[PDB]
């Protein structure tokens, strides 16, 4: 099917306590593959998936240069944005950056992304056309003007439509055992009385890949969405994911309930009934 | 990865 | 503007006393990124706990997985202690083996 590559940068000012911290990670779909931490001892971009380890030194040296120059850039920008928002030099603040590309089943470019936040909020984003920018506020309008004058969009577009997509295809081919495998969820139900008259039905999905899944509860074929407790999809720690959905049911009326499980790795959706 | 731009 | 962690405490595999496993504490939906997460075994901090590299969701909120090797037992009580600027005091969330 379709695939993504995304890089996530976070830079945090720590006033008085020296240089800002910069962390970088890269993902292909829901599999992390690289990292960089300005605080760590290596001062190198590092592998975090088996299939990226085969890249030679020139790949690692270039990638390390890129994140270092980014961390330096963010260092200057943290100051600039403090200026724009009239903030004291005493607060901690945060620049976040997400960029990347998607490709289709055939490997062709689908889209590209670049979006920037300040303190957890939209700051500036590249529009889907890869030609213009959307500023969230007055401060980011100033940034936008610098980026228009500097032709930043053209530079970003050339990356997203070229290198981004080429390397994504390469990583998809070199990691095809792990990246292109679908792990279906392994399902079961749990059941606990709350009272003599009321019981929790909890529907479990485990060991699935990728993260995307849908779990729904139904009574007599009718959706129960308002009365369903759902947890966020969570990493097992081994590359796969977990999720559950629970309903509180009248003791004795369990047979009316059905959990429905949808996932890419399932030929057909599963139905579970206690 | 991609290459920096200033704000 | 700040957001307080969602906290989940759980095991990699369904838990069987005497079988080696991983205890996980997943924290998500938070801002800022600065956070401490400890895993506790009977009220005591487990010394060697690792974590994932910092990343964030489309809403800019951060997420992290803390984990350790462990072999659960009937009497061993586990919890996750999350210390964040949004929490007046560290939130202790205990491991319920069916959540």
Residue numbers in the entry:
A (entry chain A): 1 to 274
B (entry chain C): 1 to 7
C (entry chain B): 1 to 99
What did the published study say regarding this structure?
Continuous and unambiguous electron density was observed for both SSCSSCPLSK (10-mer) and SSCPLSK (7-mer) in the antigen-binding cleft of HLA-A*11:01. Overlaying the Cα-atoms of 7-mer (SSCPLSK) with 10-mer (SSCSSCPLSK) peptide revealed a r.m.s.d. of 2.16 Å. The 10-mer peptide adopts a 3.4 Å bulged conformation upwards compared to its 7-mer counterpart; as P4-Ser and P5-Ser of the 10-mer orientate towards the exterior, while residues P4-Ser and P5-Ser of the 7-mer are seated in the cleft and thus adopts an extended conformation. Despite having an unoccupied A pocket in the antigen-binding cleft, SSCPSLK is held with the main chain amino group of P4-Ser hydrogen bonded to Tyr7 and Glu63, and interacts with Tyr159 and Tyr171 via two water molecules. Moreover, the side chain of P4-Ser makes a hydrogen bond each with Glu63 and Asn66. At the C-terminal of the 7-mer peptide, P10-Lys anchor residue is bound to various residues of F pocket in a similar manner as that in 10-mer peptide. Taken together, the results provide strong evidence that peptides <8-mer can form effective bonding to reside within the peptide binding cleft and provide overall stability to form pHLA complexes.
Recognition of viral antigens by CD8+ T cells requires successful folding of the major histocompatibility class I (MHC-I) molecule and β2-microglobulin (β2 m) with peptides typically 8- to 10-mer in length. The peptide binding groove of MHC-I molecule contains six binding pockets, A-F, which span and accommodate the binding peptide from the N-terminal to C-terminal. A minimum 8-mer peptide is required for structural stability of the peptide-human leukocyte antigen (pHLA) tri-complex that is contributed by two amino acid residues of the peptide that serve as “anchors”, one that fits in pockets A/B and the other in pocket F4–6. The overall structure of HLA-A*11:01 in complex with various peptides (SSCSSCPLSK, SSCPLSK or SSCSSC + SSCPLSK) is similar to the standard MHC class I molecules.
